[PDB]
């Protein structure tokens, strides 16, 4: 189906403790496949997925140069941002960058992204047209004017429609055994007595990939959104994800409750009950 490639950059200043740290991670869908860390003993792009290890020395060298240059650029950006918000040199600040492309089954570009946050808040984003920017505040308007003057969006667009899509196609080809494989959730319902008159029903979803899943409880066929406790989807450490949803049920009324599971690895949605 649809696939995405995303790079996530984090630069963090640390006055008194050296220059800002730059770290990048790269993902295809929910699979991390590269990292770079300026705090590494010998900073270099490193493989984090089996299917990327086949790339030649040229790949790692080129990308490593790109990350080191980007780390320097980010240090300059952090200085500028400090200025834009009238901040001193004493505090620590964070610049995050997130960009990449979404393609369909035929590998054609569906959507490009290229955006930024400062100290956790949206700062500036390339619009869906890949030709203009949306600035979150008057500081980001300075960045916007600068990038308009420099026709920066054209470079971003050139990457997103060109190299981004082609590299994603390549990765999908080389890692297809994993990247093009949906692992369905393994599901069960557990029962936990709370008191003489009440018990918890917990619906489990384990071992699924990708992370996107819908997990709901119904009582008499009616959604229980407000009375359902639903934990965030969490990584198992083996590429797969986990999630559960729980409801508190009156004793004896257990069979009126159904758990509903939707996942792309499931041809049709599951319906589960206690036992």
């Amino acid at each position: 189906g649809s696939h995405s490639m995303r790079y996530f950059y984090t630069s963090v200043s640390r006055p008194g403790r050296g220059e800002p740290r730059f770290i990048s991670v790269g993902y295809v869908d929910d699979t991390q496949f590269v990292r770079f860390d300026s705090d590494a003993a010998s900073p270099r792009e490193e493989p984090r997925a089996p299917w990327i290890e086949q790339e030649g020395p040229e790949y790692w060298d080129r990308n490593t140069q790109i990350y080191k240059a980007q780390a320097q650029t980010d240090r300059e950006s952090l200085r500028n941002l400090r200025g834009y918000y009238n901040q001193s040199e004493a505090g620590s600040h964070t610049l995050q960058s997130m960009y990449g492309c979404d393609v369909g089954p035929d590998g054609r570009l569906l959507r490009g992204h290229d955006q930024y946050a400062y100290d956790g808040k949206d700062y500036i984003a390339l619009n869906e047209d890949l030709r203009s920017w949306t600035a979150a505040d008057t500081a980001a308007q300075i960045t916007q004017r600068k990038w308009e003057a420099a026709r920066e969006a054209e470079q971003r667009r050139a990457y997103l429609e060109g190299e981004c899509v082609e590299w994603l196609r390549r990765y999908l080809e080389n890692g297809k055994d994993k990247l093009e494989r949906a692992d369905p959730p393994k599901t069960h319902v557990t029962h936990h007595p709370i008191s003489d008159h009440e018990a918890t029903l917990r619906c489990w979803a384990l071992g699924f990939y990708p992370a996107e899943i819908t997990l709901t409880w119904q009582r008499d066929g009616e959604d229980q959104t407000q009375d359902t406790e639903l934990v965030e989807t969490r990584p198992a450490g083996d590429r797969t994800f986990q999630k559960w949803a729980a409801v508190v049920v009156p004793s004896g009324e257990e069979q009126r409750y159904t758990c509903h599971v939707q996942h792309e690895g499931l041809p049709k949605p599951l319906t589960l009950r206690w036992e």
Binding site: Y7, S24, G26, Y59, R62, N63, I66, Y67, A69, Q70, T73, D74, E76, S77, N80, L81, L95, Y99, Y116, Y123, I124, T143, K146, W147, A149, A150, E152, Q155, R156, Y159, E163, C164, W167
Partner: peptide
């Protein structure tokens, strides 16, 4: 692969 700095004195914020 990451986007390279072909510009390149203007890609900063």
């Amino acid at each position: 692969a990451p986007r390279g700095p072909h510009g390149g004195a203007a890609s900063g914020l």
